[PDB]
Structures are given as C-alpha cells and as structure tokens.
Amino acid sequence: QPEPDMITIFIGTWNMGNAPPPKKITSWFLSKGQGKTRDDSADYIPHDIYVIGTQEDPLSEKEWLEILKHSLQEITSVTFKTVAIHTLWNIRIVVLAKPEHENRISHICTDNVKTGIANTLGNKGAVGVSFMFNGTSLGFVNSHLTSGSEKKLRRNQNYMNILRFLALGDKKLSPFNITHRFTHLFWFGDLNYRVDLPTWEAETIIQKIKQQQYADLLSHDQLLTERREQKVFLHFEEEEITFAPTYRFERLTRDKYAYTKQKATGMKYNLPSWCDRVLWKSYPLVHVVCQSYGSTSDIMTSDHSPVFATFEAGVTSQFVSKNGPGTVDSQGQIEFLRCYATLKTKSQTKFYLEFHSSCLESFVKSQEGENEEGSEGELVVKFGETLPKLKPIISDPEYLLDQHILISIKSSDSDESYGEGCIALRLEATETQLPIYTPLTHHGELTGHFQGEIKLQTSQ
C-alpha cells in the first residue's frame, strides 16, 4: 500500500448559538449550499481528515462525537477514528481521520488560549490541535474572537494573543510560534469581523444579499480590510467569498437576517456579516489548493450558518535511508551565500541566526553578523559567506527538495528572537547559487526581511 503524496482535509466552523443541532447535518460535510461547493460526483469519497470547530457548543464531547461519526458513516460508510478533541468553555475542536491513517498520525498535541482580562476573560479564546501525518506537520486553530462591530482592534489583539500563546507542534522549535511550526496551518472560527457600513444601511445590505451582489459588502468586511492593511493574519490566505453572510439569522429559517438592536444584544446592531471564516498558511512551494468554501443553507438551529472549506494538501513520506535518520548523509549540504537580514528594530545589539529543520539532527547557531546602517534608517545585519554549512540527515533529492529551513534572528544580549521566517529547499537547480528570501515576523508582525543566496548539494 503506497504512502500518499496528497490528502484532502475538511475544515468546518459553526457557531451553534447554544442550541442542539438538527437531526441531519450531512450537507455541511458534503460542502453543499452556497459559495464554492463540492461536485455531487464526490459525495461518497471520504476526506482523509475532518476538522470540526464549534463555538457556543451546548453538547458534551460524547454527544457531539456521536453525531459527527454517525454523520460521516452515513455519507461514506467509513467509521472514522478520533484523533483529538479539545474544548475550552463552549469552543471545541474535533479531528477525525480515516482508519487507514491511524499509524500515519503521531505527535498529537492540544492546547487552548483564553483571551482578554477580568471583564473580557471568561468565554472567548481558541482551541487547537496539531499532529504529524507521515513527514508533514499539520496545525488547526478554532478561535471565537471578541464580538461587536466596533471591536475590530480587540479581535486583532485576540489573534496576536492566540498565535503567541497557543503551544502546539514541536516544542524544540522554541523561537517559533504556531505561524511557523507547521507545513500547513488552518485557522478558522467565529472570528466575528463585521461588514462595516452604517446602521441606517441595514435594509440596503439585505437587498444586496437577496441579489447575490456581495462586492460592495466584501469591500467593507473588516477581516479583508484589516488583512489588506497588515493588521492581522499576515501571510495567511483565504479563498474568495461567494456565499451570503453567515450571521445573524432568525433561527429555523434562512429567509431573515435579525440585525436590529435588542436588550439580548446589549443594544447593538448585528448587520449581516461574514463572522465565520477559514484561513490557512502553508510553507512556501508546498501544494495546497482550496476545493470548496461555502455555507450550508439547510441547517437553521443557530443564528449562524455552518461554513465548510476543503483542501488538497501535499504530504511527504516518513523517509528512511541507509544513513539518516541517526547519522548525517555526507553527500548532502546546504550553503548560504551573501546573506543579510534587514530589521525594523531601533536596538543596537549584535545578532546571530538559528537554522531549524527536521532535515537537521539539531538546530544550528551561526556566528554574529556585522551590523551596518541602511540608506533609509534601517538595521542591516550582514552574514556574508560566514554562515555554517548545514548537514542534512538524508541527501536523497526526493527528500531534501521537499524540506524547509526555519530561520530565527536572535539578539546576542538577550537570546530573544527579533524575527522568524522560512526558506523552501524546492529549488530550480542543485549545486547552483540561487536567490532566497523570506519576510521575518515576530509575534506574527513584520519585523524585517532575510535574503541571500543558497547552494544545495543532494546525492544527484
């Protein structure tokens, strides 16, 4: 039985509105309703992995797991295995996988982050799961961010707290947050960003929705605008939205948006909004293709509609040669030439690099770089040809060209990372000097850039 080089992943997010689900929720897992939907001819074909995020979930873990498993069995005639389930308050994540994957999945982590302080601590935050699937690291975050049209900045703060403090993936990657620890990272939930138009325009918005004319609404969606201004979700992707706003509906129909201020809303308006979202971030030059992104039309117990997204995702095998794992492969090397970091910091410490990768036996520390002043004020840290030669555990090009090098630039004075990035080894050529580049972030904000050239030697 051959190891896969692609899998399909289902991501679902649903704010259940504290109500039990209806007896049939199969449309969700079939990617049927509005938006980019799945072809009928694929209905019986199971996804490899199903990741279900709920918010305002009133069910026990047992109750929800029974509903999910029975739903997937009815669709696929497959009895899915539970990889992980984690709940914070009424925020939950379930990961299910085909039984044939049970001995491909390992290093399962779970964690949660509670957002806010005092007043604002007690119901919002995030849960997450990570694991390895053969040689590929996968992370999944379900977040329920702060509600309300006039709290977009709070949502952005909630995002930064979650990516700083959620402890998933390989703890040895100590300089790196979740935005760098995984081959593929999916972040979804009730992110609670709103369509930022005047209250007086509610009926006009509803009109536009009935005409399926979303362009003038999406141009005011706070998550798209905050992302465009680099305030949140830097370096994440989202598929184009082609489905109606998923909030706020009257329950038991989808015919009516309930937007007017009520005591139950704290006297706030809930203009129709795309609260419920799926985003991803994959390492450079790894295959990832969104094959569905939409909302169901027939699940009406909540004031939100369920959202689905599905993905093709490239995966690699658990590589064994005669040499690595447990020795180097003298036939392999990675050389960095003419490298420099450009940093936005105002500090004057020396910096060194760390190179982290599962193709190395352990991370590698460089010598300190040489600080210069850039033309437009910036700090430039020059490494020249001083960087260590990296010795990968396996030299086979079928392995090595699929790997990635994480880079952290650290202060000599504090050993704190000032910036993190990632370089793909999927090069156009081996034994050839080629340009490399990554942006550098810290706490998911842009802090600089790293650029130079690489020279990769494989056994071919």
Ligand X SMILES: C(=C/c1ccccc1)/Nc1nc2ccccc2[nH]1
Give residues in contact with ligand X (CB under 6 A). Answer: 224, 227-228, 235, 237
Query: What token pair was written down for 76?
Result: 């696929």
Map residue 443 onto helix, strand or coil: coil
The secondary structure of residue 432, as a DSSP letter, is S
> To the nearest whole angstrom, how small is the minimum distance from the Cβ of residue 227 to ligand X?
4
Q: Which is nearer to ligand X, 237 or 312 (CB)?
A: 237
> To the nearest whole angstrom, how small is the minimum distance from the Cβ of residue 132 to ligand X?
24
Q: Which is nearer to ligand X, 95 or 422 (CB)?
A: 422
> To the nearest whole angstrom, how small is the minimum distance from the Cβ of residue 156 to ligand X?
14
CB-nearest residue to ligand X: 227
Q: Which is nearer to ligand X, 235 or 426 (CB)?
A: 235
Q: Which is nearer to ligand X, 73 or 219 (CB)?
A: 219
> To the nearest whole angstrom, how small is the minimum distance from the Cβ of residue 234 to ligand X?
8
Place of tokens 């509610």: 202
Which regions of 304-378 does DSSP assign to beta strands (E)? 307-314, 333-343, 351-356, 364-365, 370-373
Q: Which is nearer to ligand X, 14 or 243 (CB)?
A: 243
Q: Which is nearer to ligand X, 227 or 248 (CB)?
A: 227
Q: Which is nearer to ligand X, 335 or 445 (CB)?
A: 445
Q: Which is nearer to ligand X, 235 or 382 (CB)?
A: 235
Q: Which is nearer to ligand X, 102 or 237 (CB)?
A: 237
Q: Which is nearer to ligand X, 197 or 279 (CB)?
A: 279
Say how far apart CA 5 and CA 347 lie, in whole Å.
45
Nearest to 195 by CA among 178, 214, 177: 214
Phi, psi of 53 (to 5 degrees): -110, 130
| Cα→Cα distances 74→10, 66, 67, 298, 388, Å | 16, 12, 11, 17, 55
Say how far apart CA 329 and CA 458 lie, in whole Å.
9
Map residue 216 onto helix, strand or coil: helix
> To the nearest whole angstrom, how small is the minimum distance from the Cβ of residue 228 to ligand X?
4
> To the nearest whole angstrom, how small is the minimum distance from the Cβ of residue 165 to ligand X?
23
Cβ–Cβ under 8 Å, residues 27 and 299: yes
Nearest to 133 by CA among 176, 83, 174: 83
Nearest to 52 by CA among 145, 140, 132: 140
The secondary structure of residue 192, as a DSSP letter, is -
Say how far apart CA 249 and CA 247 lie, in whole Å.
6
> To the nearest whole angstrom, how small is the minimum distance from the Cβ of residue 221 to ligand X?
10
> To the nearest whole angstrom, how small is the minimum distance from the Cβ of residue 178 to ligand X?
16
> To the nearest whole angstrom, how small is the minimum distance from the Cβ of residue 342 to ligand X?
17
Say how far apart CA 110 and CA 131 lie, in whole Å.
9
Give exposure, 309-333, as e/b (b: 16+ Cβ within 10 Å). bbbebbbbbebeeebbeeebbebbb
- Region of 457 please: left (phi>0), alpha (psi -120 to 50) or beta: beta
> To the nearest whole angstrom, how small is the minimum distance from the Cβ of residue 172 to ligand X?
26
Cβ–Cβ under 8 Å, residues 404 and 454: no
Query: What token pair was written down for 129?
Result: 């799961």
